Design a protein around this ligand. Structure first.
Ligand code: HEA
Ligand code: PTY
Ligand code: PTY
Ligand code: CUA
Ligand code: CU
Ligand code: ZN
Lengths: 58, 236, 100, 56, 535, 48, 268, 124, 117, 338
């Protein structure tokens, strides 16, 4: 409606049944890329810290 | 001098400064022993009198005169300790006429010694390097990890002013009997002084950490008579 | 800061208005927690208080507390020679006559 | 009389502070007149026999 | 998923203290074993275990220092006992910033990985606990080892700063109905003071280490004398953090002892206000004295006097605390449970270790004791016997209230005696070796220093037996812990008084001076629904 | 489910593998890690 | 507590935060950043596309924290009078530690200033290193910071008197006027005749005037967030705790700059 | 008489429902004027309230101090054995011999070393 | 989400505290945007009613077993800290009065009873 | 040596302001007392020297506080404040003269004056409730007293145990020189403004706390800065900043006060050395008289003006005068030949 959706998003965040970071139907775009890239970043810092204990360089 | 096998106390002294250090330490230990005995006796009394006691004094909790008394006496003890410390700190130093100078450059894992005097016109200053004798090459009777191939030789009853500098990392020049311990920084010149009263051999070791072979850098100072010093100088 | 003759009046007043066994034990517990040993009048009121609440063990333990609070033994025997009519009238028996 | 006791912990405190300080002073007056002074005397006697040999 | 939202995505303050405890045990076991490796090489002259490597001996010393100053004492004493006890003492259901507490925990395991990876990728980081600049350059240490060890001191700093800020902001505006800031218990005051020192001391360390990193990896010439710098500057920027640090490890200990001496000696603490003022003075004068760590570098003759005068003045407040503890134990009744034994052993060993401090504060005498095992013997009596003893006392005091399960008294006493004897045998000969002139950080020594070194390697093997027995004690606590409360009357929090009959005692058992021992057997998840009231 | 075994991150009773194995492996790994590093550094530098 | 239906609402004025996964993710991102940065400087990686990913993930983690912290205050409605005071105390205690890192660099500057080494000629800014003229762009930056401090007080007094257009123009001007500060200080690093590694002077000049740069980029982001959140009707005439925190930060930065301009540019 | 006589050897074995009956039978017998109470009642009344059962037991018994002492001695013996086992297997350098530590004495005697307390390198 | 409240007599939960909306072009007021435990406090302070009490415990009289001090609690138990009759004489003793038993304060003797609301 | 001479000045200058805050009015009495006895010290310093009076002042202060402890009578308290102010005046004058004597070079003097004046601010925070009725405050202040005693003992060991003309241009004649009047009066105006600001402000202590740190920072920095930047310029900025702040926050006033103090104190000795006799001891009396007179007389007048013409109007007039004092300070750049 008008620019005051404040009195309408306050009735949705209450009685939602989901965590507040995954309730609105827009959190997918924030939460899929973030957790997708975090896995690669963590799996690349463990491939090179076990590859460095063996003396292999690039 | 040389360390003794089952040591308990300081090494023998050969300089006024070390005697001053010993006297100040023996002065402080007096009051420290007093305090320790007092505390230990109080705990002994508490255990022997008041263990599994029927009466509990649950209203003795303030004190007014006793809190002045466990706050003033430690102050006067600190003042008494502080007086001789300041006297020793300001008094003992090279007040008048240093007589000889030896530059001690501390390289990575050996020492380098220069005698700033005894120069000719062309720059033939007496200089040498002190290394460590390994275990395999020791002769019969030589001390391990304290014996060097070249040793500093100095006269008895002459002021010696050591200038300490370094070229690689932060080292430390120590000779416990003579009361000498100074640092060797990579870009500054430090100085200490010593006077030796009796002839003998004095051994020392480095202090600050510098790497792999930090435990193999002995210092050896011999104090000979004037005639022997002349003979030694007329050969190097 | 309190004097002997104010201690020995405050505690008679306290013992004369306790209504349960809990109260008598509470008042006795902090009566024997000062630098002053209670006078025989205070103990005389304490025994009557123990009599109203109908307890026997407390009347025997009040006397066992005096043996530890007192400095020496002549004082302990001097207490027992002023509190003698009260004991023989109430019926209180000391622990060393029971051997429990 | 014997039925009037007022103060007995204060005297205990005074006697337990007057024995923990005398004992400490005894244990500290042995460090300074039985472990320290004779050592200095021995050292100074040593240095005044070394000078006589050099004089002669 | 209930597991994940409750022990990984967590907000309750009492569910993070348990994880701090489990981390502290691991990181203490590691450092103790590294210390044993240290003492099995300084047993007899020669090259015994580490075949000839003088590197790999400095790595062990550095790792033993870091794992046991940064990963054992702070997480155990400000994490385990602060997060769990401060809110309950002040009547707060939780802390003000829960997610910050969670991050404070979770930054640590990422930091231990870096430290363990700086000891395997190349020769290592044998620079000592204090990473001095001209040695930790790229000429002696060329590898990803010193850098990965500086990044383990950055994450811990963030964790400590966040925790301290949380504590200060919780103890101010999150109290109960009638608790003013003069009726607080002493443990809360200790946590507050250590938090203030943490705020005022950590950024200097961060600046120093980051400048060193820039010098190593980007040739900035902060500490290089060929461009106009001085190494000594680093020393200043280290020791401004160095000396406040050594108090952060002992102040939380002090408060614990107070509680114990007020429980098993049934008497209130002698001069509570005196002790709060004493802790305040000890903390404040701990920032004005940081140059007695550098007396041999060539300081002025008018700056040594100030530092030798300002170091001895600390003895007054600590003497006040010690005398107050003896005063509070004087008149009351004493019953020798396992926490009271540690409380007694603290009062003597800390005094013996701290009286060595007044001898090393003189600039005249430090010429004979610097870089020598006198210092080692000094600080092990105040750290291994002042902080660890307080931790053990706290565990034996508060474990039944948290877990609901009791422990065997006899095995606890056996462990206490073993630890006492081993620690006393292991650290006293260091004073003699220091007086005779043994330098520090040396793998091999001359033949004269053998004998006492053979006695100091005998107590370490007793301390490790004590640790294994501690592990068995925890095991016997967790299994069949409910049936251990009837073996001994040590389970009782307070014995009946002289006139208090058994029947009356069984109806009114807990008489306390804080909320801690009125909460249920394991404290409820949401403990305070309707607020507590104080007069 | 509040109780004396409900605040611990691990299960102690009514368990397939007895608790002694998880308890002991923790201490064994903790006290054996510092020897692996020494072995790795000694074998990387020739000596044994 | 004797109101009729009082048990249906909380009995104490504090916030019980729900379970959130952000601490673990920020910790993992920081671990990855630390390891990658420690390795990449000594080989062992080669490609520089991992460090950037780590930094991006860390920043995303802070942003996703702040989303929940805003939803908990503007929509759910859990910010009583006590929670607000707690937040203010926390922010002030962070700003204090943020200031104390600068005292360290100032001490490191005065320790090298007084007592110059023998290797360098006994003179500040030495031969071959021409300092920066303080009658140039460093004068514009001071005027711009003073004006920026003056324009944000017009916004906070334009929100208590209930004017919308008058709170947006001030924020716009402040953001667009700190962007000029960043630009003027990024085109003065390209007109210099001394590098990071020529002396101790150029190693402290770029270590106290480079951290200020990052803290100004933080200000730009914060003011962008405040404008975007005021445009969408989130701020009331008596409940705006982003504006106060972003005003206490600008003044601290200005006061720090007035010391970086008297001690680094004039004295030498 | 059997219910009250010799409570010192039977009191803790009874259930928790046979103790309240005794306590509530001695609570209506003490209301009478004392000197009407038997001696066994007096002893039982003293034992029930102030006696060595339950919360008045000692922390340490005579059979626990022996256990602690013999545990600590056993803990010391294991460490002694392990240290000896590690001590027999050592690297003994050539300098740790008496025939070598007698020559060092001659060297340190020619150059007068430690004229005070003493020089001696003999420890074998 | 439901009917909006006007004073704290028709507020039965968090469903009655949403509020009307502001108008486009104005800075909204706290009386038009406040939902949870903020608008409760705001409504209480506009009448004189303090929703969160901060009045310490009674220190006027002692308590006998016939006339005990009454403590109101919305739970079965409440923690009470006693310090004496003249309010700072007795040291602090903590107690847990509940619905089946009363506290008695081993030092001074004041008795506390629990009133369930 | 030279550093020790500074530590003594720090302690002495800290003590006076620590007593100001303590009270136990009485402070008003103490200040007048100082004005009265300060001039005399010029004669004493020239002949006996500084070190004898310097340490005597400390023991006179100690016996004064002992008299405080002994007697609670109001007349006895006034006499104790009088003796305390006498000792403070002697110690301050002797310390300033001795520190001037040790550091001959102007730049070193400017360096040391800031660290010396830092104790002046430190005394404000350190001992406001100094030695309060409760013994806990005495216990808390015991450690700092011990430190002061040990450093004074170090001074005694250096000066005594171990080996370490006539003034012209009278005070009125000195005032006849305009530069002396300007330099002395600038400090007086700067202190007077804040002194009048402080009492009326709370009606219109916590706010004044940041000013304590601001004064320390300013005094430390500007002592070094002034020689390179130009001493008159720092005063010209500082006085106008003080006027701007006063006319219409505490930290800025403190920092500007640090500006004015560090700019004006060392510059006085320069004028005395250049255009007068080479005497350091006599000159500081004028400055000290300005310091004491500003706080002794004027706070009562400021309080009386407040609520009569209003706090805003009193602050407006004080700010107006302070802002107008700025043009006069420009003349302090260079003195004429003499
Ligand atoms: C955590 C334990 C701890 C504590 C609490 C302290 C606090 C103190 N430390 Fe600190 N100290 C360390 C551990 C600790 N220290 C460590 C590990 C180092 C160096 C680390 C490194 O170099 O890498 C160090 C550094 C250090 C040094 C540097 C030594 C050097 O390398 O040359 C010195 C002395 O020079 C010293 C002494 C003191 C003193 C006097 C105290 C005082 O606070 C203690 C005072 C105690 C008392 C005074 C006892 C109580 C007194 C009484 C019972 C009655 C009062 C007595 C009188 C008034 C005389 N410490
Ligand atoms: C280092 C700087 C880290 C900045 C931390 C924020 C500083 C202010 C702390 C504060 O009061 O606010 C917190 C928000 O922080 C945040 O949202 C960010 C904190 C995490 C920053 C990244 C840490 C890197 C290490 C609240 O946190 P809250 O969620 O508990 O407040 C629950 C709401 N009622
Ligand atoms: C140093 C490294 C960490 C730096 C981040 C520090 C973050 C501090 C956040 C402090 C927030 C305090 C707070 O409670 O603010 C809430 C929201 O603020 C906010 O949401 C402010 C968001 C600030 C984001 C800053 C992100 C910078 C990251 C670095 C970029 C480069 C209040 O909201 P409210 O109560 O006023 O709303 C009510 C309208 N009814
Ligand atoms: Cu090299 Cu020491
Ligand atoms: Cu220290
Ligand atoms: Zn009470």
């Amino acid at each position: 409606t008008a620019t005051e959706k404040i009195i309408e998003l306050q009735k949705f965040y209450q009685s939602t049944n989901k965590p507040i970071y995954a309730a609105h139907p827009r959190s997918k775009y924030y939460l899929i890329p973030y957790f997708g890239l975090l896995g690669v970043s963590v799996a690349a810092t463990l491939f090179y810290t076990g590859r460095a204990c063996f003396g292999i360089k690039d | 001098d040389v360390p003794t096998p089952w040591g308990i106390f300081f090494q023998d002294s050969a300089t006024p400064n070390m005697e001053g250090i010993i006297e100040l330490h023996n002065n402080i230990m007096f009051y420290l022993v007093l305090i320790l005995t007092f505390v230990s006796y109080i705990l002994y009394t508490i255990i022997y009198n008041y263990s599994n006691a029927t009466i509990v004094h649950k209203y003795m909790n303030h004190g007014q005169l006793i809190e002045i008394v466990w706050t003033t006496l430690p102050a006067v003890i600190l003042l008494i300790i502080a007086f001789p410390s300041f006297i020793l700190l300001y008094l003992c130093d090279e007040v008048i006429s240093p007589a000889m100078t030896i530059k001690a450059i501390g390289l990575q894992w050996y020492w380098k010694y220069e005698y700033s005097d005894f120069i000719n016109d062309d720059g033939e200053i007496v200089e040498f390097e002190s290394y460590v004798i390994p275990e395999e090459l020791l002769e019969d009777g030589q001390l391990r990890l304290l014996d060097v191939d070249a040793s500093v030789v100095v006269p008895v009853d002459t002021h010696i002013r050591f200038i300490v500098s370094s070229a690689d990392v932060i080292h430390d020049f120590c000779v416990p009997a003579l009361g000498v311990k100074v640092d060797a920084s990579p870009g500054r010149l430090n100085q200490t002084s010593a006077l030796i009263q009796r002839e003998g051999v004095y051994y020392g070791q480095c202090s600050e950490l510098c790497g792999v072979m930090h435990s193999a850098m002995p210092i050896k100072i011999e104090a000979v008579s004037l005639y022997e010093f002349i003979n030694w100088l007329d050969e190097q | 800061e309190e004097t002997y003759e104010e201690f020995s009046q405050r505690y008679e007043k306290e013992f004369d208005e306790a209504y349960d066994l809990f109260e008598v034990q509470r008042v006795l517990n902090n009566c024997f927690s000062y630098d002053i040993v209670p006078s025989p009048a205070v103990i005389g009121k304490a025994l009557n208080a123990c009599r109203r609440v109908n307890d026997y063990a407390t009347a025997v333990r009040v006397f066992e507390g005096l043996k530890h609070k007192v400095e020496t033994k002549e004082q302990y025997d001097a207490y027992l020679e002023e509190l003698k009519d009260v004991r023989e009238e109430l019926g209180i028996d000391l622990k060393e006559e029971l051997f429990p | 009389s014997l039925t009037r006791i007022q103060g007995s912990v204060k005297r205990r405190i005074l006697t337990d502070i007057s024995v923990g300080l005398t004992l400490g002073f005894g244990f500290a007056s042995y460090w300074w007149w039985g472990v320290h002074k004779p050592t200095v005397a021995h050292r100074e006697n040593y240095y005044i026999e070394l000078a006589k040999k050099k004089k002669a | 998923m209930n597991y994940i939202n409750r022990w990984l995505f967590s907000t309750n303050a009492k569910d993070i203290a348990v994880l701090y405890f489990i981390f502290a045990l691991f990181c203490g076991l590691l450092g103790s074993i590294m210390s044993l490796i240290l003492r099995l090489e300084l047993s007899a002259p020669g090259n015994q275990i580490l075949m000839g490597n003088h590197q790999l001996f400095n790595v062990v010393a550095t790792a033993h220092a870091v794992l046991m100053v940064f990963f054992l004492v702070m997480p155990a004493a400000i994490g385990f006992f602060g997060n769990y006890l401060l809110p309950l003492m002040i009547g707060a259901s939780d802390m003000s910033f829960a997610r910050l507490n969670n991050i404070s925990f979770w930054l640590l395991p990422p930091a231990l990985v870096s430290l363990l990876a700086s000891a395997l990728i190349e020769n290592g980081a044998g620079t000592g606990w204090t990473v001095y600049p001209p040695l930790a350059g790229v000429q002696s240490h060329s590898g990803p080892s010193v850098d990965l060890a500086i990044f383990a001191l950055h994450l811990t700093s963030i964790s400590s700063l966040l925790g301290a800020i949380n504590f200060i902001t919780t103890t101010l505006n999150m109290r109960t109905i009638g608790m003013t800031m003069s009726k607080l218990p002493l443990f809360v005051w200790a946590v507050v003071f250590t938090s203030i020192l943490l705020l005022l001391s950590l950024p200097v360390l961060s600046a120093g280490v980051t400048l060193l990193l820039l010098d190593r990896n980007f040739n900035t010439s902060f500490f290089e004398p060929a461009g106009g710098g001085d190494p000594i500057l680093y020393q200043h920027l280290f020791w401004f953090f160095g000396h406040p640090e050594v108090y952060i490890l002992i102040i939380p200990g002090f408060g614990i002892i107070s509680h114990i001496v007020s429980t098993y000696s049934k008497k209130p603490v002698f001069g509570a206000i005196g002790m709060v003022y004493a802790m305040g003075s000890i903390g404040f004068l701990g920032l004005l004295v940081w140059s007695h760590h550098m007396y041999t570098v060539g300081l002025d003759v008018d700056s040594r006097a100030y530092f030798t005068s300002a170091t001895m003045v600390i003895a007054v407040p600590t003497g006040i605390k010690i005398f107050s503890w003896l005063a509070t134990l004087y008149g009351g009744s004493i019953r020798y449970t396992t926490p009271m034994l540690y409380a007694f052993a603290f009062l003597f060993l800390f005094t013996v270790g701290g009286l060595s401090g007044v001898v090393l504060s003189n600039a005249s005498l430090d010429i004979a004791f610097h870089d020598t095992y006198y210092v080692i013997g000094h600080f092990h009596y105040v750290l291994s016997l002042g902080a660890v003893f307080s931790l053990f006392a706290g565990y034996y005091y508060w474990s039944p209230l948290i877990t609901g399960l009791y422990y065997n008294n006899n095995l606890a006493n056996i462990q206490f005696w073993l630890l006492f004897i081993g620690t006393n045998v292991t650290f006293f000969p260091m004073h003699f070796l220091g007086l005779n002139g043994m330098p520090r950080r040396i793998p091999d020594y001359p033949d004269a220093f053998a004998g006492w070194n053979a006695i100091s390697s005998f107590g370490s093997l007793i301390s490790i037996i004590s640790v294994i027995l501690f592990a068995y004690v925890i095991y016997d606590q967790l299994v069949n812990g409910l049936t251990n409360k009837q073996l001994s009357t040590n389970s009782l929090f307070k014995n009946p008084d002289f006139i208090e009959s058994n029947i009356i005692f069984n109806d009114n058992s807990i008489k306390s001076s804080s909320i801690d021992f009125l909460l249920t057997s394991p404290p409820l998840p949401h403990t305070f629904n309707t607020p507590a009231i104080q007069s | 489910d509040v109780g004396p075994y409900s605040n611990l991150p691990f299960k102690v009773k009514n368990r397939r593998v007895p608790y002694a194995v998880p308890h002991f492996l923790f201490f064994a790994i903790g006290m054996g890690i510092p020897f692996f590093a020494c072995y790795v550094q000694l074998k990387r530098s020739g000596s044994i | 507590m004797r109101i009729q239906n009082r048990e249906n609402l909380q009995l104490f004025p504090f916030h019980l935060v729900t379970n959130s996964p952000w601490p673990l993710t920020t910790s993992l991102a920081l671990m990855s950043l630390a390891l990658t940065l420690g390795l990449t400087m000594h080989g062992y990686i080669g490609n520089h596309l991992w460090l950037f990913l780590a930094i991006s993930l860390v920043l995303s983690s802070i942003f996703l924290w702040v989303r929940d912290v805003v939803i908990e205050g503007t929509y759910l409605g859990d910010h009583t009078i006590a929670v607000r005071k707690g937040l203010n105390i926390g922010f002030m205690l962070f700003v204090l530690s943020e200031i104390l890192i600068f005292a360290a660099l100032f001490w490191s500057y005065f320790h090298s200033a007084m007592g110059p080494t023998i290797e360098i000629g006994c003179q500040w800014p030495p031969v071959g290193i021409t300092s920066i003229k303080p009658t140039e762009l460093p004068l514009l930056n001071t005027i711009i910071l003073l004006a920026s401090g003056a324009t944000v007080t017009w916004a906070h007094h334009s929100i208590l008197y209930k004017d919308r257009q008058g709170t947006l123009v001030g924020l716009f001007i402040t953001t667009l006027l700190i962007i000029l500060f960043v630009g003027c200080q990024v085109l003065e690093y390209t007109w210099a005749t001394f590098t990071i590694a020529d002396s101790v002077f150029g190693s402290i000049f770029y270590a106290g005037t480079g951290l200020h740069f990052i803290h100004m980029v933080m200000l730009i982001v914060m003011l962008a967030i405040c404008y975007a959140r005021m445009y969408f009707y989130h701020f009331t005439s008596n409940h705006h705790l982003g504006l106060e925190t972003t005003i206490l930060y600008l003044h601290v930065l200005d006061i720090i700059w007035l010391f970086l301009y008297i001690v680094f540019y004039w004295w030498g | 008489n059997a219910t009250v006589t010799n409570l010192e050897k039977r009191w803790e074995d009874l259930p928790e429902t046979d103790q309240k009956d005794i306590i509530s039978q001695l609570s209506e017998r003490q209301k009478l004027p004392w000197k009407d109470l038997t001696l066994s009642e007096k002893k039982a009344a003293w034992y029930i309230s102030f006696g060595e059962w339950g919360p008045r037991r000692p922390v340490h018994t005579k059979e626990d101090k022996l256990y602690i002492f013999w545990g600590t001695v056993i803990g010391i013996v294991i460490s002694a054995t392990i240290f000896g086992a590690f001590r027999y297997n050592r690297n003994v350098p050539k300098t740790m011999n008496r025939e070598w530590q007698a020559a060092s004495d001659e060297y340190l005697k020619s150059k007068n070393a430690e004229p005070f307390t003493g020089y001696s390198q003999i420890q074998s | 989400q439901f009917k909006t409240a006007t004073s704290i007599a028709e507020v039965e939960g968090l469903e009655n505290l949403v509020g009307p909306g502001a108008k486009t072009g104005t800075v909204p007021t706290d009386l038009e945007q406040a939902t949870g435990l903020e608008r409760y406090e705001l409504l209480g302070k506009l009448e004189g009613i303090e929703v969160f009490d901060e009045t310490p415990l009674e220190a006027v009289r002692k308590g006998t077993m016939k006339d005990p001090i009454l403590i109101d609690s919305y739970d079965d138990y409440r923690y009470v800290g006693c310090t004496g009759v003249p309010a700072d004489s007795h040291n602090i003793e903590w107690l847990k009065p509940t619905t089946e038993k009363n506290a008695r304060c081993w030092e001074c003797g004041s008795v506390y009873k629990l009133n369930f609301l | 040596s030279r550093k020790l001479i500074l530590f003594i000045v720090f302690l002495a200058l800290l003590l006076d302001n620590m007593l100001l805050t303590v009270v136990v009015l009485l402070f008003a009495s103490k200040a007048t007392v100082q004005l009265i006895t300060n001039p005399f010290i010029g004669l004493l310093t020239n002949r006996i020297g500084y070190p004898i009076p310097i340490f005597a002042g400390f023991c006179i202060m100690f016996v004064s506080t002992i008299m405080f402890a002994f007697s609670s009578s109001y007349a006895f308290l006034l006499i104790a404040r009088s003796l305390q102010g006498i000792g403070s005046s002697c110690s301050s004058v002797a310390g300033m003269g001795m520190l001037a004597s040790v550091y001959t070079d102007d730049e070193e003097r400017g360096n040391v004056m800031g660290i010396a004046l830092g104790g002046l601010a430190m005394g404000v925070l350190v001992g406001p409730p100094f030695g309060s009725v409760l013994y806990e405050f005495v216990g808390k202040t015991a450690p700092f007293l011990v430190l002061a005693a040990l450093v004074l003992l170090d001074g005694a060991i250096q000066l005594f145990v171990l080996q370490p003309s006539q003034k012209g241009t009278p005070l009125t004649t000195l005032l006849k020189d305009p530069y002396i009047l300007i330099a002395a009066g600038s400090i007086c105006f700067a202190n007077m403004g804040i002194a009048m600001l402080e009492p009326a402000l709370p009606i219109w202590g916590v706010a004044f706390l940041p000013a304590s740190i601001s004064y320390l920072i300013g005094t430390n920095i500007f002592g070094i800065l002034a020689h390179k930047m130009g001493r008159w310029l720092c005063a010209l900025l500082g006085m106008i900043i003080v006027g701007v702040s006063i006319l219409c926050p505490n930290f800025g006033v403190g920092f500007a006060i640090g500006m004015v103090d560090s700019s004006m104190m060392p510059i006085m000795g320069y004028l005395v050395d250049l255009r007068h006799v080479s005497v350091y001891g006599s000159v500081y009396a004028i400055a000290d008289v300005a310091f004491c007179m500003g706080y002794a007389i004027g706070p009562s007048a400021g309080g009386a003006i407040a609520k009569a013409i209003g706090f805003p109007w009193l602050m407006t007039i004080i700010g107006i005068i302070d802002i107008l004092f700025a043009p006069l300070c420009f003349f302090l750049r260079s003195p004429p030949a003499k």
